[PDB]
Structures are given as C-alpha cells and as structure tokens.
Amino acid sequence: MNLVLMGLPGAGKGTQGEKIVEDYGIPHISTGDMFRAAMKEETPLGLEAKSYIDKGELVPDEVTIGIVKERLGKDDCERGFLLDGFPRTVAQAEALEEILEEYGKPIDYVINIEVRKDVLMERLTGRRICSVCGTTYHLVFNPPKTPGICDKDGGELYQRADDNEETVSKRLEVNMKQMQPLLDFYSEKGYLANVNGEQDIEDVYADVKDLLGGLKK
Numbered sequence: 001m002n003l004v005l006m007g008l009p010g011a012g013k014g015t016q017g018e019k020i021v022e023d024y025g026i027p028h029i030s031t032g033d034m035f036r037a038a039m040k041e042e043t044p045l046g047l048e049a050k051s052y053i054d055k056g057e058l059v060p061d062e063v064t065i066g067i068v069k070e071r072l073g074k075d076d077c078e079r080g081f082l083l084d085g086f087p088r089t090v091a092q093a094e095a096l097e098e099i100l101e102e103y104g105k106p107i108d109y110v111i112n113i114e115v116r117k118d119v120l121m122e123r124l125t126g127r128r129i130c131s132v133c134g135t136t137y138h139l140v141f142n143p144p145k146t147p148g149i150c151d152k153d154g155g156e157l158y159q160r161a162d163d164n165e166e167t168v169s170k171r172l173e174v175n176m177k178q179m180q181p182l183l184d185f186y187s188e189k190g191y192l193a194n195v196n197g198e199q200d201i202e203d204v205y206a207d208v209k210d211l212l213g214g215l216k217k
C-alpha cells in the first residue's frame with residue numbers, strides 16, 4: 001500500500017494519516033514532521049529548512065527530495081508507506097516517480113483531501129499540538145478532554161509557530177499556487193483520488209477506508 005496524502009495547509013493530512021497508519025500498518029512519512037524534528041535536534045538539515053518554514057515558504061525542492069529519497073530507502077517502507085505533504089510541487093512529484101521506479105515501490109494512489117481555502121485559517125489558528133507526541137487537536141472541532149493537555153500522555157498543548165495568522169496566509173498562498181500543477185500531474189497518471197475533507201473527521205476517514213480496503217493484502 002504505497003500512498004501519498006496531499007491537501008492544502010490545515011486540510012487534515014495528519015489527522016487522517018494517524019488513523020491510516022494505525023489501521024493499515026504503514027509508516028507515516030510527513031516532510032513537515034521531519035523538518036520539525038530536525039529543527040528540534042538543531043541539525044544542519046533543520047537550520048537550512050527553518051529559514052523557509054518560519055516564513056511559510058516551501059523548503060527548496062532539492063533538499064526536500066533528498067530527505068524523502070533516504071527515508072523511503074528504509075526497511076519499514078517495503079510493504080507500503082504513507083507520504084504526507086510530499087510531493088508538494090510538480091518537480092517533487094517527477095523526482096518521486098523516478099525514486100520509486102528505482103526502489104520498486106510505485107504509488108498506488110494519491111489521496112487529495114479537498115478543503116476550501118476559506119475554511120483553513122480557522123482550522124490552523126484553533127489548532128493545538130501535543131508537545132510530547134505531536135498529535136493535533138482543535139479548540140472547537142476536535143478538543144482535548146482536559147483543556148490545554150493531551151489525552152494520551154498529559155503533555156502541554158502548544159501552537160505551532162507557523163500557525164499565526166500572517167504565516168498561515170503566506171502558507172495558503174504559497175501552497176495554492178503549487179497545487180494545481182501537482183493535481184494535473186497525478187490526474188494525468190490516473191492516481192488521484194479526491195476525498196471531501198469538509199466532513200466530520202470520521203466521515204472523511206470512512207471515505208478514505210472505502211478506497212484503502214481495495215488495496216490491503
């Protein structure tokens with residue numbers, strides 16, 4: 001089960017991906033999560049990425065494709081994987097095609113979680129993340145049991161630094177402008193599977209499951 005999860009900032013990629021990886025047993029490979037782990041470790045990858053991420057810009061294609069090429073070479077991708085937030089540009093998608101050909105791990109489908117731009121500020125500004133495990137909540141749409149604390153581990157919730165309104169606007173503009181060529185790319189391959197992301201979390205997931213049940217062993 002070799003999958004890409006794509007969608008605009010805030011569309012619910014992490015929310016759905018967490019469910020997918022628990023139910024279907026494939027690794028969750030989020031480039032945003034990778035860059036943030038690098039930044040927390042203060043590695044050289046993290047320092048290079050940080051300049052772009054803090055401004056809401058895309059990290060350049062070449063280093064992004066490099067981190068993904070190396071990640072997809074691990075033994076845990078041999079029966080399937082869930083890329084989340086990559087590819088984000090058509091050049092990334094072209095590069096991934098070639099990587100996956102050499103690796104013998106061709107994509108089955110690209111799931112596109114479709115959500116109107118106008119709804120995404122409110123998703124991102126109300127988002128609260130667990131400092132311990134990185135699971136996401138929303139103050140209105142998906143609140144924790146105990147305000148300000150993760151259900152799983154009692155960790156303090158925070159706001160991601162790029163979830164401020166200015167940076168969210170830049171992220172939306174930047175990502176909208178890259179999205180259409182990417183959708184065109186995958187629609188021409190036939191791999192693109194669109195899901196309505198403006199439903200209850202469990203209803204988006206039910207639609208995801210309708211596709212993935214046809215791909216499991």
Ligand SMILES: Nc1ncnc2c1ncn2[C@@H]1O[C@H](COP(=O)(O)OP(=O)(O)OP(=O)(O)OP(=O)(O)OP(=O)(O)OC[C@H]2O[C@@H](n3cnc4c(N)ncnc43)[C@H](O)[C@@H]2O)[C@@H](O)[C@H]1O
Nearest residue numbers: 009010011012013014015031032059085088127137138141
């Ligand atoms: N390939 C690449 N190339 C170049 N640069 C790259 C790159 N990948 C990363 N980068 C760099 O890294 C940065 C960060 O990338 P990344 O971390 O991937 O950020 P992104 O694509 O902006 O997406 P988010 O993680 O913000 O949102 P999500 O879709 O996962 O939504 P979530 O499930 O949390 O949900 C959002 C909120 O809504 C809530 N929610 C979820 N589902 C629903 C629902 N159905 N209804 C109501 N609320 C919901 C959640 O509880 C949560 O509060 C980029 O800006 C860029 O600089």
Ligand SMILES: [Ca+2]
Nearest residue numbers: 072073074075
């Ligand atoms: Ca290897």
Ligand SMILES: [Ca+2]
Nearest residue numbers: 200202203206
């Ligand atoms: Ca329902």
Ligand SMILES: [Ca+2]
Nearest residue numbers: 199203204207
């Ligand atoms: Ca429905």
Ligand SMILES: [Mg+2]
Nearest residue numbers: 013014030032
């Ligand atoms: Mg995410």
Ligand SMILES: [Zn+2]
Nearest residue numbers: 130133150155
């Ligand atoms: Zn937690």
